[model samples]
Every structure is written in C-alpha cells, then in structure tokens.
Target: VEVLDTVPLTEDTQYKVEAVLLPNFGKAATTGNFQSRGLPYTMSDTLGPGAALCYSVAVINLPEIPDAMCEDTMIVWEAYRLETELLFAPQMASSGYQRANGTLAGIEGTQLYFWACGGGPLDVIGINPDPERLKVNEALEGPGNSDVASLQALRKQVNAANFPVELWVADPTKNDNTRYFGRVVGGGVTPPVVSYGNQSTTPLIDENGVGILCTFGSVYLTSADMVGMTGLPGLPTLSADYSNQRTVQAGYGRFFRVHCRQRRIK
Candidate 1:
C-alpha cells in the first residue's frame, strides 16, 4: 500500500520506506572514515575499543548546489575512504528537511564530517536528535536543525583531549570466527538456543555443537515472533527438525548467511 503522509515524517506516526541501505559490505571505512562498528564492552581485542554501533552518516562541505537541495533527492559523495558516503533513506529522519541551511551542508569547515550512531542491538534515531549529546553543535534545537545527535555515549563520556573522536567503519565481508559458541538441547524448533562467547581466543574451531557463527545484533520478534528460519548458515544436528532461530541482525544493509545465539555478550 502506498502511504501518503498527511504530516511531515518528523511529526508522524507512520514510518517511511528505504530504497537503499548503507555501510555496505565489501567496502573500506577502516581507520576512521565512516561510522565505527563496535559491539560492546571489550572482548574481541582485534583493533578493539570494546565495541561501537555499526551506523554512520557522512556530511560533505559543499560550496553551493545548483538544484533545490532540500526539495530534491540528493546523495553524499565521498571520493575518499573507498568512496563510501551516505544516502538519505526515507525510512529514517530526513536530514534535508531538518536543516535551516538550504544548502544542506551542515558542517562548515576544511573537512568532511561523518556522524556515527550505533543503530543496532536496541537503538533507533527518531525525528531530529537528542540535543543533550551535541557537544559542539548544541545550537541545533529542532527537527530540521541538525542531522544527528549522535547515539554513541562515548561521544559525551570521553573528553576530547583525552582521546578525540574519529570516524571509522567495521569490516562486514568475511566471518572472523573469533567469537566462541555454546548451546542447550531444549527440544525447540529454532535449533537448540546456541550461544556465543568471546572473540579474543582466536580461530574458534567450534560452537556448543549446534552450528553457530560470529556476527552482530538481534531482536525479540513479538509474542509469536520466535518463528524459525530454515537453513540460514547452520543449525542443530541432534535436534534436527528444531528451527526457530532468532538470527543476529545488523544496524544497516545485511545479506546474511552466518547465524548466532546470543547477540552481544556485553
């Protein structure tokens, strides 16, 4: 069904749709370019800062635009950092309509800005952002003012002088198999509820013997939401027919095969 918005998405009850997804795999944002992909606490220890949300937004400082910047469909072009930037997915808040500057170039300077918000595991950005987290751009007080009030608590908790924030992305193409695994045979359809341990002990050659893999986040799936997914990576061997696997989910853009039990250990 095609939904016509009687009101702006910022002031709304209806959710929009997304045509394209971001932080795409087989890309490079490593060493601070896109959003940092962190899980939680500190366990993996492979370029580890504990973990961070796998969401990122790129801001370009353009001179001027020839088209109606706010009223038209636009794209953020990042020539560097593997030429990866951002697309305005209508599903989320629109940074265009939320800006006073029609140019849509929020950050004015000699550099490109990439805002990182951990959008998975249990985080979503509504219309506008929480101004409390704006350390430098606190003046942005309303819907179309700032594109983000970053979700990373690290943005506010850590002092810049202690360790300045940087834009970085996670590698999502290959499975590291670093996270540990476990399972309990409970006669269910979603294969015995598998488990994931830590990512520090390197080259984890096994799971709790149910067939699991290493990945990111997950969801609760409502009351009857624990429905099973058949043949998504691996399942139980003994329980055989067991299937209701609540496979792990990422913040954005995922073509998955690997599965896991516990989402984030932290």
Candidate 2:
C-alpha cells in the first residue's frame, strides 16, 4: 500500500509507496495446512485512492499432534509477487516461539502503521543456517548476531542480487535473543556500518490462561527507509554504527494472533 509523503495533493510529487501485505511463504514440512484469516481493514468504495489504509491477519489454529516430529508448525510470510513477476524477495520472516509450558506460542493483535514521506529503500535478510563466523559477544548479541563480517556478507549478497535496500532479520530460533535485527553500511569515504536490534514482547494470554504467542508476519518499515516518519509513537530506535548516519528505527505491525483452537472437520 502507498503512504503519501506530500500534503495538499500536489499535481506532480512522488509519495512514499510500497506493496504491503503481499503473500509469501517460507520453508516448512506441512505445506498446505495453513490458511489466510482475511484482511484487517475492509475496503470501501467510497474512500478515495489516497485514503490512509492499514491491514492485519489472524493466525490459523493447527490440529492436535499425535507425534513429536510434527509438533511445531512453521508459518511463513514470503516475499510479494504479481503473477509471473517477483516484486520483492522475502527480507525477514519468523515462526512461533515455544513456551516453557510445552505449548507453542505465536503473535496476535499486531498492527502495522503506514505514514506518508521520509522513507528509503529497506530489505529484510534472513539468516537461517546460523552463520559460520560465530562471534558471540553477549553484550552486543541479540536473537541474531550483529557481527560485522556476517552482515557485510549479507549486504554483498543482496547488492549482488540487485535489491536497493538495507537488510534485516529475526532469530532463527525463538530461544535466542536476536529477535529484530538489522545492518547497514553508510555512504562516505570512511563509511561505518550500523546495526539495529529489538526483542519480541511476551506472548499474549488467552482466557484459559494459556499463552497465545505471536510473531512478526511482515517487515515493518524502518526510519532508515524514511526520514522523520510521522504517526509513529512509542516505537524504539537504534543508533547507526556510522558517525554521520542517522538513527535507524521500526514500529510494530499488525499481529498475526494465533488462536490455538481445535481443528474442525470439513
């Protein structure tokens, strides 16, 4: 969805734009077991093209497991595509977190805030196969590693593939600390690399007192993508590793609330 940057509806001005909520999938054992819960905001014909818009989706409840191997389910939100054309590759995606009570949890009531203007090209980068260079600095480590070497490698890969945006990813496993993580290199003679980090909040609880866990199903646009972004409050910010670069930040998006109910028979 497009978020206009300009006000007063100018005749010729480029507005902040993006293709939001496009369907994409990640790797999983059970492929077709999942389904869409439906759009968060319903479309109204009365609203003009420039109306501010937002959307969300609920998580699907999986059936009871008879075996331990199939105990956990992987819910993937892949990159966006249009028929035969791939608009963007999957930057970052996350699965649910397993609780101490032996029940798996996912995110819910997540909201995506769309605003006009001051945005830049941002990309999500996934680090599935834990990187080889394991620089585990407890003080600087999150769910994923912000190691300069690894991030530079990721940056090279994305640039080689021809995507003009910064890269970010969540943790490969929920048990880890690196939940919301990112890396970027500034443009200057002595360019310094910048990194961003954040952890997912505790899972929401149901009426029965069971923890209903949730995670980010989509990438929330960051401050690096837009400058002085409007309409964002309480969102956290991270400093750029570079001296001259500005701080990078992101706000939470629509939660894919997973309701762990019994699966119904067709």
Candidate 3:
C-alpha cells in the first residue's frame, strides 16, 4: 500500500516512516523506514484478507543541531474479521452454597473477560447487582478504629449481602484456558430435582446457608466475557454443560442417572 503525506515539508529536516502490517492469517511484520523520503511514499507490503495497516512518520534531526524540533503523524487502517468462538464449562462445587468454578478451552494468551447470568447463558447482567455494591469496606479496619477484628468479618458481610453478578478476566500471560470462581443468589423459593434441558431452577439454600438456584435458570457464562485475543488460531467452536446432584428422599439407598446434551454456539 502507498502512504501519502500532505503536511508542509522543511529543507533541513528529513522524514523517517515506519509501518506495521497485521493479518489474521499470519504473524505481524514491521517495515522500518531507514531512508529519508520527501513526499508520497509506498509501504513495503501489499494488503490482503484480514489485514491491518498502521503507519507513523517522524522527522529526523540534524546531527549538528542537538535540540532540533521534529514533527510526525500516524495513520491506521484495517480490512479483516474481529470475532471468534470458544468452549466453556461452569462446574458447581460439590460442597458449599452451590458456588461454581468455571473454565474456558481453546484459547491461550488471549485477553479474556466474562459476564455471568443467574438463569441461562443468554441472561447477562440480569439480577446481578452492580459491582460497586460488592466492594469490601476498607474502613472496616484502621489504626485504632478497627470496626472488625479481621478480614473474615468483612467477608461475612459480603457473603450475606446480595452483591451484583461478577465479571472476571483471565491473565494473557497464563494458559489459553483459564479458571474463575463465582456465586449467585436465590432466584425463587422452591428448588427442583435433577432433570434435563437448559432451564433455571429455584434457588436452594444449601446446608451451609448460601443461595443456589437463580431466577434466570441455571447459572452460565457468555461471550460478553471476552475482551480481546492475541495469537489466536481460526474461529473456535463454543459449547457449555452443567450438572448437579440431589439426595433422593427414598429411605432406601437409591440413585438415578440423568443424560444431557452439550450446547453449542456457532
């Protein structure tokens, strides 16, 4: 591609331009403008599918003038796709108030963030309180005025309150697949037994006294959680699955098997 500059030129100061080409199909490259150019100049490479062009120009200084003033400009253009897919699993803790640990597959070194829904995958930011409402009260502890004895006391309050749903991000430096933890509120008063289908069940207060079921259906994570990706392969195939166990009231020891299918988004 060709890059043209309309800015007025000076006789003493020469320009050195730099350009970078990023394409979804391959690795990125940078073409350093080692030579000085006067007016319109051509970049090193040609544009292609899923390609991005970024260029910047800077004025070179005269060796004799130690404090020479310089000026430059930058431009960026792109012609490519920006979306991809991936698979995820929200595993409920065997114990505790139905708190769950989540994991994503098929992504590494990608910037990831997540939005959770209380009921189903599509229900995002629904019923979950704003994050601000859940901030730990720092004022609870200080020099002489320790309102609480330890961090445990502060956590107790957070566990009891109806905090908003949480959003989490995975560190890019880590593995492509990442894990996170979260909790949800009681959606209703009655809880249901094990069954099949993508539906939210009633919030059940477990033996530990934490709310389990949410109003929306089953708890889930969605694409809204992803912020960015780096060095990613082609499009990913996204999917999800969930399962939980309940004690049967039959005095006799008996168990039932439930079969379910995985959900996919293409």
Candidate 4:
C-alpha cells in the first residue's frame, strides 16, 4: 500500500513464473471419462515472473514527483487461477490450479512480469503497469476495443519483452487425459506455429502444424514443472483441442498452467 524507490530495472533483471493445468475423469460430469482437453486458447509469449505472482516497480513521471527522484508502486495478478467453468466439469478443477493476485499493493503504472508456471504464490515483484506509459496487445479479443487488432500492433507496444508461442499437450497414456502446453518467444518465430532450430533436420509444428520438428523445448523451465512437462511429447490427440498427459504422478499431478502479467514503462 505504499511507494518505494523509482529506478529502472537492470538489463540483467529477468524474472519468470509458471503454472500447470490438470485434467480428470470418472463420474465427473456430462462427458464422464470422455471429457479431456487443453487450453482452448493461448497466453502471453513471455511472462515476467512465473504464474500466480505479480511484480511491482516505481514510476518516474508522476505529476507530484520531483524530476530527479520518483516513487514506486505495486501490481498484483492471479495468473495461476484456473476457471473450472472453462473446463469440462467444475469438480475437475483442483486447488493447485487456482490463480491469486500478487501481494504487492498501491500500483500506478504498467508493470511487466513473466510467467514460468501456473498456481498462486504471488508475493514477488516483477514490474509495474501504466496504461499511458505502456500498452498491452493480444491476438484474442478482450472485453473492449482497447486490445490490439493484430500481433504487430501488440509487438510495437512491447518495449518490455518479446512475444512467444505456446505449445500444449495432454495426458498421453491415461483415460483421464491431462493436457499440457508450452510457450516460446524471440528468435524470429511465431506463436501457434512451430519452426526449425538453427541446426537440426526436424521441423516444428504449431496449432496448424505448419513448422518443423525439434522445436518442442522445456515448458516448465525449472524443477517445478518437470513432471508435467516431461509427458508433453508423444501425446495422443483426443479428436481435437485435447491431448494426453506427458507424465503422471500418484493421486496428484499437474499438466500445464497459463501465464499472464502487467508491464512497466516510464
């Protein structure tokens, strides 16, 4: 609920957040064991921190602030929070899939954060959000006309970080298929579309399956997402929009989570 020092983040100051989506079956709802799927949509290319955590930073151009010095504000976001309403059955939703707002308070400007995982542990700070200072763009239609019309428009507004594409898969070996997805940005690649690497005979595949192989990389980026992400490859397609779980744990297992964040500008 207060402001701190206002200083630009160091070029080396990079953060990441992440999340995991879980799927289930058995007397659950309308589909029974047949209900299985992944995120029907895509998320931001590169989230500042992992999922469920929002960042905070200071704004230098406030009206009441001196030119030499400025105050900082906080921002909060619940990226790890998953809406079971979007899933097949509400009961399918679990506590681990929920998103929560960052603990930081009194935010003022646009804050930029990263998403490395899903689930809420949002006490960390990433960036700030100020509409006038920075702009956020997405391919999907938002609540209003404020969002960008094309990916390029959103790219232009991206002074903080580069955009990336997310690739998702579901549980491959179980009847209660668990879906998973991964995101990759930078290197002149596009989202939903996979491409070949600098050195490789394989091509990547996007949602439309338009690229090359060997494009699939680590979705978890850390020890947290290893189990879920490990099962992404070789997943079977459940008609469409759904995939098989890459890896499976005991009674508890994660697939993949969505990542979101606010950016910063002075």
Top candidate, metric lDDT: 2
User: Which runs of model 1 end up more than 4 angstroms from their true locations?
Assistant: 1-21, 24-52, 61-232, 237-248, 254-266
Stretches of candidate 2 exceeding 4 Å from the true structure? 1-9, 12-19, 27-152, 157-266
**Which candidate model has the greater lDDT, 3 or 4?**
4
**What's the true lDDT of residue 216 in model 4?**
16
Cα deviation of 202, candidate 2, in Å: 25
| Per-model TM-score on C-alpha atoms | 0.19, 0.19, 0.16, 0.16
Residue 37 lDDT, candidate 1, scale 0-100: 24
lDDT by residue (tens digit), candidate 3, 1-266 = 22223223344332221221111111122232221111111121222211211111111111232232224322211101111212222212311132132322222211222222112212111111233333322211111222333332222111101121122122223211112222222322122122223242222222432221222212222222221111112312122111111111100111111111111111
List the candidate 3 regions with Cα displacement exceeding 4 Å: 1-110, 113-210, 216-266
Q: What does candidate 2's lDDT look like per residue over 143-244, in tens digits?
A: 243334354334211111111121133223231211122233333212122222232232323233322121232222221121111111222212122112
> Each candidate's root-mean-square deviation in Å?
24.8, 23.9, 27.1, 21.4
Winner of 1 and 4 under TM-score: 1
RMSD of 2: 23.9
Worst 10 residues of 4 by lDDT: 53-62
In candidate 4 the C-alpha lDDT for residue 218 amounts to 18
Specify the highest-TM-score model's number: 2
Query: TM-score of model 1 relative to the true fold?
Result: 0.19
Model 4 per-residue lDDT tens digits across residues 65-184: 123222453322212221111111121112112113322111111111122221211111112123233322342111122222322222111111111111111112321111223232
Candidate 4 yields a Cα-based lDDT of 0.21
Against the correct fold, how does model 2 do in TM-score?
0.19
Give each model's whole-structure lDDT.
0.21, 0.22, 0.20, 0.21
